PDB file of all heavy atoms in Angstrom:
ATOM      1  N   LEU A  21     -13.410  11.069  -6.028  1.00 10.71           N
ATOM      2  CA  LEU A  21     -13.950  10.588  -7.299  1.00 10.71           C
ATOM      3  C   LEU A  21     -14.893  11.626  -8.046  1.00 10.71           C
ATOM      4  O   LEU A  21     -14.935  11.695  -9.293  1.00 10.71           O
ATOM      5  CB  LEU A  21     -14.598   9.258  -7.050  1.00 10.71           C
ATOM      6  CG  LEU A  21     -15.724   8.862  -7.947  1.00 10.71           C
ATOM      7  CD1 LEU A  21     -15.258   8.893  -9.427  1.00 10.71           C
ATOM      8  CD2 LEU A  21     -16.226   7.469  -7.421  1.00 10.71           C
ATOM      9  N   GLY A  53       7.708   6.935   4.626  1.00  8.13           N
ATOM     10  CA  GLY A  53       6.872   6.085   5.348  1.00  8.13           C
ATOM     11  C   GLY A  53       6.146   5.082   4.491  1.00  8.13           C
ATOM     12  O   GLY A  53       6.683   4.501   3.546  1.00  8.13           O
ATOM     13  N   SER A  55       4.473   5.575   2.289  1.00  6.75           N
ATOM     14  CA  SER A  55       4.452   6.031   0.947  1.00  6.75           C
ATOM     15  C   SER A  55       5.568   5.594   0.128  1.00  6.75           C
ATOM     16  O   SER A  55       5.666   5.712  -1.052  1.00  6.75           O
ATOM     17  CB  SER A  55       4.475   7.547   0.987  1.00  6.75           C
ATOM     18  OG  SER A  55       3.195   7.965   0.563  1.00  6.75           O
ATOM     19  N   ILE A  80      12.639   3.336 -11.315  1.00 16.97           N
ATOM     20  CA  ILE A  80      13.551   2.959 -10.147  1.00 16.97           C
ATOM     21  C   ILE A  80      13.016   3.623  -8.985  1.00 16.97           C
ATOM     22  O   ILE A  80      12.784   4.758  -9.035  1.00 16.97           O
ATOM     23  CB  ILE A  80      14.969   3.417 -10.394  1.00 16.97           C
ATOM     24  CG1 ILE A  80      15.486   2.639 -11.602  1.00 16.97           C
ATOM     25  CG2 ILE A  80      15.853   3.203  -9.192  1.00 16.97           C
ATOM     26  CD1 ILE A  80      16.816   3.144 -12.152  1.00 16.97           C
ATOM     27  N   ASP A  84      15.422   4.017  -0.074  1.00 15.24           N
ATOM     28  CA  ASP A  84      15.357   4.386   1.329  1.00 15.24           C
ATOM     29  C   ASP A  84      14.321   3.533   1.943  1.00 15.24           C
ATOM     30  O   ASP A  84      14.518   2.969   3.002  1.00 15.24           O
ATOM     31  CB  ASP A  84      14.819   5.846   1.506  1.00 15.24           C
ATOM     32  CG  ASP A  84      14.468   6.186   3.040  1.00 15.24           C
ATOM     33  OD1 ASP A  84      14.099   5.233   3.752  1.00 15.24           O
ATOM     34  OD2 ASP A  84      14.551   7.356   3.575  1.00 15.24           O
ATOM     35  N   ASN A  85      17.924  14.066   4.539  1.00 16.66           N
ATOM     36  CA  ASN A  85      17.185  15.103   3.817  1.00 16.66           C
ATOM     37  C   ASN A  85      17.506  15.231   2.365  1.00 16.66           C
ATOM     38  O   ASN A  85      16.636  15.676   1.588  1.00 16.66           O
ATOM     39  CB  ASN A  85      17.456  16.428   4.486  1.00 16.66           C
ATOM     40  CG  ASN A  85      16.114  17.207   4.938  1.00 16.66           C
ATOM     41  OD1 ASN A  85      15.356  16.705   5.797  1.00 16.66           O
ATOM     42  ND2 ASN A  85      15.833  18.464   4.365  1.00 16.66           N
ATOM     43  N   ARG A  90      20.183  13.694  -3.995  1.00 13.13           N
ATOM     44  CA  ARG A  90      21.401  13.150  -4.470  1.00 13.13           C
ATOM     45  C   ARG A  90      21.210  11.997  -5.499  1.00 13.13           C
ATOM     46  O   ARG A  90      21.767  11.989  -6.517  1.00 13.13           O
ATOM     47  CB  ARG A  90      22.135  12.605  -3.244  1.00 13.13           C
ATOM     48  CG  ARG A  90      22.954  13.683  -2.586  1.00 13.13           C
ATOM     49  CD  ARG A  90      23.675  12.902  -1.484  1.00 13.13           C
ATOM     50  NE  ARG A  90      24.597  13.760  -0.778  1.00 13.13           N
ATOM     51  CZ  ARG A  90      25.247  14.840  -1.212  1.00 13.13           C
ATOM     52  NH1 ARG A  90      25.104  15.247  -2.491  1.00 13.13           N
ATOM     53  NH2 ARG A  90      26.026  15.436  -0.383  1.00 13.13           N
ATOM     54  N   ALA A 119      13.296  19.753  -6.700  1.00 26.46           N
ATOM     55  CA  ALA A 119      14.240  20.747  -7.021  1.00 26.46           C
ATOM     56  C   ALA A 119      15.324  20.085  -7.927  1.00 26.46           C
ATOM     57  O   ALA A 119      15.607  20.605  -9.127  1.00 26.46           O
ATOM     58  CB  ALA A 119      14.861  21.403  -5.858  1.00 26.46           C
ATOM     59  N   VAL A 128       7.738  16.408 -13.329  1.00 24.91           N
ATOM     60  CA  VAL A 128       7.537  16.049 -11.930  1.00 24.91           C
ATOM     61  C   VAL A 128       6.064  15.810 -11.720  1.00 24.91           C
ATOM     62  O   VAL A 128       5.325  16.652 -12.214  1.00 24.91           O
ATOM     63  CB  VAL A 128       7.962  17.149 -10.964  1.00 24.91           C
ATOM     64  CG1 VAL A 128       7.572  16.766  -9.576  1.00 24.91           C
ATOM     65  CG2 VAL A 128       9.511  17.358 -11.070  1.00 24.91           C
ATOM     66  N   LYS A 134      -4.332  16.644   1.508  1.00 21.12           N
ATOM     67  CA  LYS A 134      -4.601  17.935   2.284  1.00 21.12           C
ATOM     68  C   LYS A 134      -4.571  19.116   1.285  1.00 21.12           C
ATOM     69  O   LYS A 134      -5.039  18.999   0.127  1.00 21.12           O
ATOM     70  CB  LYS A 134      -3.586  18.115   3.366  1.00 21.12           C
ATOM     71  CG  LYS A 134      -3.749  17.095   4.484  1.00 21.12           C
ATOM     72  CD  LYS A 134      -2.676  17.417   5.582  1.00 21.12           C
ATOM     73  CE  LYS A 134      -3.021  16.603   6.720  1.00 21.12           C
ATOM     74  NZ  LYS A 134      -2.057  16.375   7.758  1.00 21.12           N
ATOM     75  N   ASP A 135      -4.021  20.208   1.767  1.00 24.61           N
ATOM     76  CA  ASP A 135      -3.951  21.421   0.851  1.00 24.61           C
ATOM     77  C   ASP A 135      -2.856  21.318  -0.113  1.00 24.61           C
ATOM     78  O   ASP A 135      -2.703  22.154  -1.020  1.00 24.61           O
ATOM     79  CB  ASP A 135      -3.751  22.789   1.561  1.00 24.61           C
ATOM     80  CG  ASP A 135      -2.447  22.750   2.462  1.00 24.61           C
ATOM     81  OD1 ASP A 135      -1.756  21.740   2.649  1.00 24.61           O
ATOM     82  OD2 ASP A 135      -2.101  23.892   3.043  1.00 24.61           O
ATOM     83  N   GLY A 136      -2.040  20.204   0.028  1.00 24.41           N
ATOM     84  CA  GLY A 136      -0.844  20.000  -0.796  1.00 24.41           C
ATOM     85  C   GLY A 136       0.328  20.839  -0.389  1.00 24.41           C
ATOM     86  O   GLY A 136       1.245  21.177  -1.160  1.00 24.41           O
ATOM     87  N   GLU A 146      -0.139  17.594 -10.194  1.00 12.96           N
ATOM     88  CA  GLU A 146      -0.336  17.099  -8.843  1.00 12.96           C
ATOM     89  C   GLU A 146      -1.734  16.271  -8.823  1.00 12.96           C
ATOM     90  O   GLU A 146      -2.599  16.630  -9.531  1.00 12.96           O
ATOM     91  CB  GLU A 146      -0.322  18.281  -7.898  1.00 12.96           C
ATOM     92  CG  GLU A 146      -0.722  17.973  -6.352  1.00 12.96           C
ATOM     93  CD  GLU A 146      -0.548  19.249  -5.502  1.00 12.96           C
ATOM     94  OE1 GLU A 146      -0.301  20.358  -6.153  1.00 12.96           O
ATOM     95  OE2 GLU A 146      -0.680  19.156  -4.190  1.00 12.96           O
ATOM     96  N   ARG A 157      -5.925   7.811   5.194  1.00  3.51           N
ATOM     97  CA  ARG A 157      -6.986   8.054   4.239  1.00  3.51           C
ATOM     98  C   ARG A 157      -6.325   8.578   2.986  1.00  3.51           C
ATOM     99  O   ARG A 157      -6.835   8.242   1.911  1.00  3.51           O
ATOM    100  CB  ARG A 157      -8.126   8.885   4.691  1.00  3.51           C
ATOM    101  CG  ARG A 157      -8.715   8.438   5.965  1.00  3.51           C
ATOM    102  CD  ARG A 157      -9.544   7.293   5.635  1.00  3.51           C
ATOM    103  NE  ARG A 157      -8.903   6.031   5.970  1.00  3.51           N
ATOM    104  CZ  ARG A 157      -8.866   5.510   7.266  1.00  3.51           C
ATOM    105  NH1 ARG A 157      -9.456   6.120   8.246  1.00  3.51           N
ATOM    106  NH2 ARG A 157      -8.265   4.394   7.551  1.00  3.51           N
ATOM    107  N   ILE A 166      -2.177   4.549  -7.955  1.00  3.65           N
ATOM    108  CA  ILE A 166      -0.947   3.961  -8.520  1.00  3.65           C
ATOM    109  C   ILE A 166      -1.358   2.756  -9.341  1.00  3.65           C
ATOM    110  O   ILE A 166      -0.997   2.616 -10.540  1.00  3.65           O
ATOM    111  CB  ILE A 166       0.087   3.484  -7.494  1.00  3.65           C
ATOM    112  CG1 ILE A 166       0.513   4.704  -6.698  1.00  3.65           C
ATOM    113  CG2 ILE A 166       1.354   3.165  -8.163  1.00  3.65           C
ATOM    114  CD1 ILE A 166       1.616   4.336  -5.708  1.00  3.65           C
ATOM    115  N   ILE A 168      -4.398   2.406 -10.849  1.00  2.00           N
ATOM    116  CA  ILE A 168      -5.047   2.794 -12.133  1.00  2.00           C
ATOM    117  C   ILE A 168      -3.946   3.273 -13.010  1.00  2.00           C
ATOM    118  O   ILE A 168      -4.052   3.051 -14.170  1.00  2.00           O
ATOM    119  CB  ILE A 168      -6.178   3.908 -11.905  1.00  2.00           C
ATOM    120  CG1 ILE A 168      -7.176   3.388 -10.929  1.00  2.00           C
ATOM    121  CG2 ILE A 168      -6.675   4.509 -13.157  1.00  2.00           C
ATOM    122  CD1 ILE A 168      -8.093   4.252 -10.219  1.00  2.00           C
ATOM    123  N   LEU A 172      -3.518   2.477 -17.000  1.00  7.31           N
ATOM    124  CA  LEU A 172      -3.566   3.431 -18.099  1.00  7.31           C
ATOM    125  C   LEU A 172      -2.273   3.340 -18.801  1.00  7.31           C
ATOM    126  O   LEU A 172      -2.340   3.371 -20.051  1.00  7.31           O
ATOM    127  CB  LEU A 172      -3.878   4.810 -17.618  1.00  7.31           C
ATOM    128  CG  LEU A 172      -5.131   4.951 -16.856  1.00  7.31           C
ATOM    129  CD1 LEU A 172      -5.310   6.469 -16.445  1.00  7.31           C
ATOM    130  CD2 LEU A 172      -6.114   4.554 -17.780  1.00  7.31           C
TER     131      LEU A 172
END
Side-chain angles (χ1 to χ4, degrees):
Chain A
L21 155 53
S55 252
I80 294 169
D84 168 331
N85 233 63
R90 275 186 177 329
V128 172
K134 293 182 165 161
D135 54 355
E146 174 179 8
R157 309 281 105 79
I166 297 187
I168 302 161
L172 301 182

